[PDB]
């Protein structure tokens, strides 16, 4: 009973939690990349005001 309980309840919940945390971290990384791209564009556009 203990073996079946572990293999049928405990492991899949931990796997789902791991997947959820990975998705959240990846989304935050993508948002950071977008922000850095925007401010790089701003920096490049600043120098072109008067050449």
């Amino acid at each position: 009973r203990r073996v079946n309980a572990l293999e049928q309840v405990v492991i899949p919940g931990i796997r789902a939690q791991i997947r959820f945390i990975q998705q959240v971290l990846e989304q935050r990384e993508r948002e950071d990349t977008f922000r850095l791209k925007r401010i790089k564009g701003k920096i490049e556009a600043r120098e072109a005001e008067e050449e």
Binding site: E26, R30, T33, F34, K37
Partner: protein, 578 residues
């Protein structure tokens, strides 16, 4: 062509000015040293050129010259027995003229310009020519290299050179329009070659490996993938496919692997022999080799060159098998290239167009009717290496959506010295239905039913693992111990193979059919004797059982007498002593 000068250098990115007229994705020779690169963005009078190699030492004001063509390969005689990099540079001639180091700015040609060939014309003046027709034939090792008109050229024949010795650079046929046709032509590596019509695959790709071509077959022109965690026997299987398959031409592609692994394949291949002819194996193979430190553009474009060469050899009318090794490395190179272009990633840092590229690579396979009116086929087998063995990795997910066969490996069977270590539960094939008429018309009329019966017997063994995991393997009843024993026999004498023995490396379909018949007959007679009542230890001791084990090592032309002898022996022992 368009000439320009350097305006700004920043790492691999170079901005050139005065390049009005240059075209997108052209190939440019940057600087006085001769470095090459693509054009990725046009802007006013300037052009953004991204150099492949190191740009250290360059200066502002150096000339930039555009070749006027995109990335392409030279297709013609001399590609066989050759070793090439990701952008079709012959490595043997580079070593001969430079040494042990590959210096930047080296200039070589894909085809040797000084070797003479015996030209045999097959046309006369006044003939009409369209794309794909045959101009003439040229002997090359064991083949007749058909000289083909490029697919984009049509017209009328004006003058034909007579039979003699010429190089690839000399025209052999000149059209009335003024077009001069040589022995070779160039084709962009990113654009597919045209065909008359794609056919339906119904003939098997004889791998020679028993489990593959019996349980999970792949047809001619089909596609297959073979993933696996770390060392599971991938390289041995692909080189066994290279040796023992029925493909006329083999194209091996190494996408950015370790240097010692490239050394292994570059040294061991020139010693093997072709089973079809008895000559060297390299007389029918083309090798594309890239190490990890080679430029990322060549590693990214490595697979397209190989698939273009395979399409050319298909267009000549042959049957080609293309082995792409570790497409995950190609995906990593693609990710790096996308990272250098500042693109927003998707999934685990991959570009959002990965599935489109993987579909574009795998869709080129298939059995077609060529433009010259002949049959041809390209078969693709691509190895994948997920990082942790997880099959949810995006490259594996994208590959699984399009492959017709899926051979999954694991090192657990490698622990037990069980080779090939194919998971017979997780693997599957979608070519089983279409290949059955060929099997029944050419191997045996009862091959599919027997194969399904053996698959069911293998399935019945797996369902008892929930009993043997708690109760010991000896405390079972007769009807379960018998199927467990026959499953062990099947695993250790039919789903196991070695390729270092002469009479076992290449397994014909009749041989496998005979072994399967012996196993099924043994199981049926054992079950019938168990019905009559007998001790099961006697079943695990009878001497006829060893003939199943010793049916693997009979010679292929010696097999039928052995099979009949076993079929008459088995009827004797089980009726009297049981």
């Amino acid at each position: 062509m368009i000439q320009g000068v350097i305006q700004k250098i920043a790492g691999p990115a170079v901005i050139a000015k005065g390049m009005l007229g240059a075209r997108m994705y052209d190939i440019c020779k940057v600087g006085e040293e001769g470095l090459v690169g693509e054009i990725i963005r046009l802007d006013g009078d300037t052009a953004f050129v991204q150099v492949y190699e190191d740009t250290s030492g360059l200066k502002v004001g150096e000339p930039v010259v555009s070749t006027g063509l995109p990335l392409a390969v030279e297709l013609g005689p001399g590609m066989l027995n050759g070793i090439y990099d990701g952008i079709q540079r012959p490595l043997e001639r580079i070593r001969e003229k430079t040494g042990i180091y590959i210096t930047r700015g080296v200039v070589v040609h894909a085809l040797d310009r000084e070797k003479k060939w015996a030209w045999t014309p097959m046309v006369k003046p006044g003939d009409e020519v369209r794309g794909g027709m045959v101009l003439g034939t040229v002997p090359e090792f064991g083949f007749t290299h058909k000289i083909l008109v490029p697919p984009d050229v049509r017209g009328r024949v004006k003058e034909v050179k007579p039979a003699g010795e010429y190089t690839v650079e000399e025209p052999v046929v000149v059209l009335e329009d003024g077009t001069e046709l040589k022995m070779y032509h160039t084709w962009p590596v990113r654009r597919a070659r045209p065909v008359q019509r794609k056919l339906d695959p119904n003939t098997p790709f004889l791998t020679g490996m028993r489990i593959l071509d019996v349980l999970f077959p792949v047809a001619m022109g089909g596609t297959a993938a073979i993933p696996g965690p770390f060392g599971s026997g991938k390289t041995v299987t692909q080189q066994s496919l290279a040796k023992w398959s029925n493909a006329d031409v083999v194209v091996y592609v190494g996408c950015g692997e370790r240097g010692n692994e490239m050394t292994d394949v570059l040294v061991e291949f020139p010693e093997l022999t072709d089973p079809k002819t008895g000559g060297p194996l390299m007389h029918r193979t083309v090798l594309i080799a890239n190490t990890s430190n080679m430029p990322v553009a060549a590693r990214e474009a490595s697979i397209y060159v190989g698939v273009t060469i395979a399409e050319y050899f298909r267009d000549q009318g042959f049957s080609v098998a293309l082995m792409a090794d570790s497409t995950s490395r190609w995906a990593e190179a693609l990710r790096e290239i996308s990272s250098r272009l500042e693109e927003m990633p998707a999934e685990e840092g991959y570009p959002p167009y990965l599935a489109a590229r993987l579909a574009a690579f795998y869709e080129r396979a298939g059995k077609v009717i060529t433009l010259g009116g002949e049959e041809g086929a390209v078969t693709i087998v691509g190895a994948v290496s997920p990082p942790g063995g997880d099959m949810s990795e995006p490259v594996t997910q994208s590959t699984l959506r399009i492959v017709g066969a899926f051979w999954r490996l694991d090192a657990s069977l490698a622990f037990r010295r069980h080779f090939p270590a194919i998971n017979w539960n997780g693997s599957y094939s979608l070519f089983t239905s279409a290949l059955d008429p060929w099997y029944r018309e050419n191997v045996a009329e009862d091959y599919p039913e027997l194969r399904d019966a053996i698959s069911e017997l293998l399935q019945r063994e797996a369902g008892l693992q929930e009993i043997v995991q708690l109760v010991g393997p000896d405390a079972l009843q007769d009807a379960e111990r018998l199927v467990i024993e026959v499953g062990r026999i099947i695993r250790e004498d039919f789903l196991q193979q070695n390729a270092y023995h002469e009479v076992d490396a290449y397994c014909s379909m009749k041989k496998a059919y005979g072994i399967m018949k012996m196993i099924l007959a043994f199981y049926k007679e054992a079950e019938a004797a168990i019905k009559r009542g007998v001790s099961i230890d006697e079943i695990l001791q009878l001497p006829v059982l060893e003939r199943i084990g010793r049916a693997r090592y009979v010679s292929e032309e010696e097999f039928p007498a052995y099979f009949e002898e076993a079929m008459k022996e088995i009827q004797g022992a089980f009726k009297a002593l049981a």
